[PDB]
Design a protein around this ligand. Structure first.
Ligand code: TEJ
Length: 253
């Protein structure tokens, strides 16, 4: 009964632009990673030790900062994003940043050992590394769970880049001015996604896929809520700002 309309020339363009944007802003070789402050790993197995040393914070804070820059570059290439006021663009970028980082990080996440494998042994990021950066299991365990859930969706890159675009351009973000314009841009991206799934995705991965993707966006809201708490707690640690970056401090502060 459900119709399967073809992708319009505009919808085909949007996909092309977004695939192009991601390829311009996501390096699948992770070759810039050696330019960050070195990853330091010590003995642990302790929250007191974690906050005392914060050995993995300078490296992962440089990684996140770097990733924010890429997300910013990616957002500016979303069809319609430049039409928004620069004030609204920043509100959207600032509230979605960590969520899009979690989304895009899926490309490096592997279910072989439940880590983010960005090559090497140094640039393999386990759960233990994230605690060494001063974050608790309240964030990390649901994050890993989200990563696995998203991986099992076996998303086409097209679906993957549209989901990030939809995540960024969200009318229901605190502090937004022209919510009508943001919703209009999101709807254009959402229809493209819904149309893509219905006429490009083969069974049984096609059935109810869009609803599962919308649910992942809701999971991202929860992780962002928890991340915000933990970042606030982390910022209370003396001499913490040096371990972070001016960009990380503004976006999350
Ligand atoms: C210093 C930190 C760490 C924390 C980041 C959180 C806890 C998670 C979210 C995604 C995770 C990771 C993502 C991995 C990558 C590598 C690559 O896929 C690019 C992608 O943008 C990315 C960030 C691995 C370590 C912990 C990260 C950064 O926030 C911070 O500011």
């Amino acid at each position: 009964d459900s119709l399967r309309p073809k992708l319009s020339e505009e919808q085909q363009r949007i996909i092309a632009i977004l695939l192009d944007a991601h390829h311009k802003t996501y390096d699948p070789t992770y070759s810039d990673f050696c330019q960050f402050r070195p990853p330091v790993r010590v003995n642990d197995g302790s929250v007191t030790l974690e906050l005392s040393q914060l050995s993995m914070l300078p490296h992962l804070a440089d990684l996140v900062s770097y990733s924010i820059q890429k997300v910013i570059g990616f957002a500016k290439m979303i069809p319609g994003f430049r039409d928004l006021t620069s004030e609204d663009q920043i509100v959207l970028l600032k509230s979605s940043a960590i969520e899009v980082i979690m989304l895009r990080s899926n490309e490096s996440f592997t279910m072989d050992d439940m880590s983010w494998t960005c090559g090497n042994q140094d640039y393999k990021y386990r759960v233990s590394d994230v605690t060494k950066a001063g974050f608790s299991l309240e964030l990390i365990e649901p994050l890993i769970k989200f990563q696995v859930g998203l991986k099992k969706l076996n998303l086409h890159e097209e679906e993957h880049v549209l989901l990030m675009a939809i995540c960024i351009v969200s009318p229901d973000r605190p502090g937004v001015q022209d919510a009508a314009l943001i919703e209009a841009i999101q709807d254009r991206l959402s229809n493209t996604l819904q149309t893509y799934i219905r006429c490009r995705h083969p069974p049984p991965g096609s059935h109810l896929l869009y609803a599962k993707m919308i649910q992942k966006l809701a999971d991202l809201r929860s992780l962002n809520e928890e991340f915000s708490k933990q970042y606030r707690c982390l910022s209370f640690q003396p001499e913490c700002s040096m371990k972070l970056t001016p960009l990380v401090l503004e976006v999350f502060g």
